Amino acid sequence: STGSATTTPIDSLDDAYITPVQIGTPAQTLNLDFDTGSSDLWVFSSETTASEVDGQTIYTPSKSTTAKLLSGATWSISYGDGSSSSGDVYTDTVSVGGLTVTGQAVESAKKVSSSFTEDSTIDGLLGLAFSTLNTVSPTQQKTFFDNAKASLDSPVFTADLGYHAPGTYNFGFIDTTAYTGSITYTAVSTKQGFWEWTSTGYAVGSGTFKSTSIDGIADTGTTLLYLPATVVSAYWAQVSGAKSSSSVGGYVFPCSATLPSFTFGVGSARIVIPGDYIDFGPISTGSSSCFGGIQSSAGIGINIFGDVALKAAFVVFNGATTPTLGFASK
Template sequence: MISLKHVALTALLASAGSASVIPPRIGTPATEEGTFSAVQVRNTKHVKSGPLALAKAYRKFKVPLPEELQAAVANNTGSVKRATGSATTTPTEYDSEYLTPVSIGTPAQVLNLDFDTGSSDLWVFSSETPSRDINGQTIYNPSKSSTSSKLAGATWEIVYGDQSSSSGDVYKDKVTVGGLTVTNQAVETAQRVSDEFTQDSDNDGLLGLAFSSLNTVSPTQQKTFFDNAKSSLTSPLFTADLKHNARKCQNLSS
């Protein structure tokens, strides 16, 4: 998939009620009114793997994996599991370095989301996700948010370019990114996720930044976080400044 997916953006975003997991002064609004920034830091849990990176590229472009590569991937994921003492993950160099903490609900539930410029759904691991599909991810529980409401009859299903997929139902809730809040944002709660997402234990979901016309919610498409937020920004744009091992910013209206 075309994305900052698995370019995971690890930004520690400020929001009320989430200070316990966010260092002071990280992700605070920029000084200029109508402009907000989220600061990213490197994911220190990231494990580099040549075979896994190559296999990811093969799968993305739907090219069958040679037997030798399949064997290398099997050996590599096994060694990753033993080294970390956790369930098998599929880390890839260069495009899984950063995740962005996003606050959802009241009080805030902070999830690390993958910002994706190739899709338009904001979906998360949730209390509705089967336990067998959860592998250390933080989940969103709408029943614990005083500002959540279920969008009756709404469902969603998305398949990405690498054939990873997820689906479920939809809630409306308060969402905050880098000090910028949307009070009635569609939050798509996963009832099913593919193995690729289960294996990615640091990633709690995706926040799509593409055109809202690509949103998969039916029967009525929902706007992206950015489309809902842009009227409160000085300029309707976002930027990302990512550098290896460096703390940098993702800006909304920069």
């Protein structure tokens, strides 16, 4: 089997991407944030505290003929941005882009944090990291990809995120029309439950490439690119007037600037992030200070190749017995 779904930016900045997901019978279509940095499929639901729902589409298990309470199971997750959610669990039929999994754990939110409520465009998350991070207790549950894997033509999914445009998530096949050149594969560590890999270095603009190992995760659920402070300082030193603002919470730059590109290494290959991808716009409406898309990871404990980096590539998440990542230009 295969599946193919279009993913759409939620706003003009590509702050996140939503992908329609069919849950239950008859289908209830919710727009989920596919997140390769977490492992829970959770949704706004008929169980969500009413004051915490503001415009999201909700899953109502009682209207699904295939929904079953997973008795005793609860979940609770906290993300890197400080957001959180929790609730109970149903199993149901879940389809993405024509690929169907029966018996998928659908984690129904009873509580969501303010950042979820305030984002009307995101009806929940669909985690695509390794199932070892799934938070369901007392019986850990599998991701949609882990449940689909054995049925897929190839045990892979691909992320092809757009810059200010829709893109695609494919399951079970590699669309050889979606990228240029060849795909460079690189090793993955699953020890922290992430798609964790080691970049071979970086360049700023037309500058020379610096060979240096940068361990980090491929995380579609993170907007920005978070790298070590040395790398980030080297990048923003090339932008006149850029500075790290403790008041704003990262590097800002004059909105009049033209940003340089940033290149990262994948083995001997190179992925170029155009400068425009690094512009996240005014820090507040009407400001002439703009927020940067490359930020320090120093306060995180891990480097994160988020959407700023991934949208510059065609990315293969290879879930073979020994997982690997692949990157191609596009």
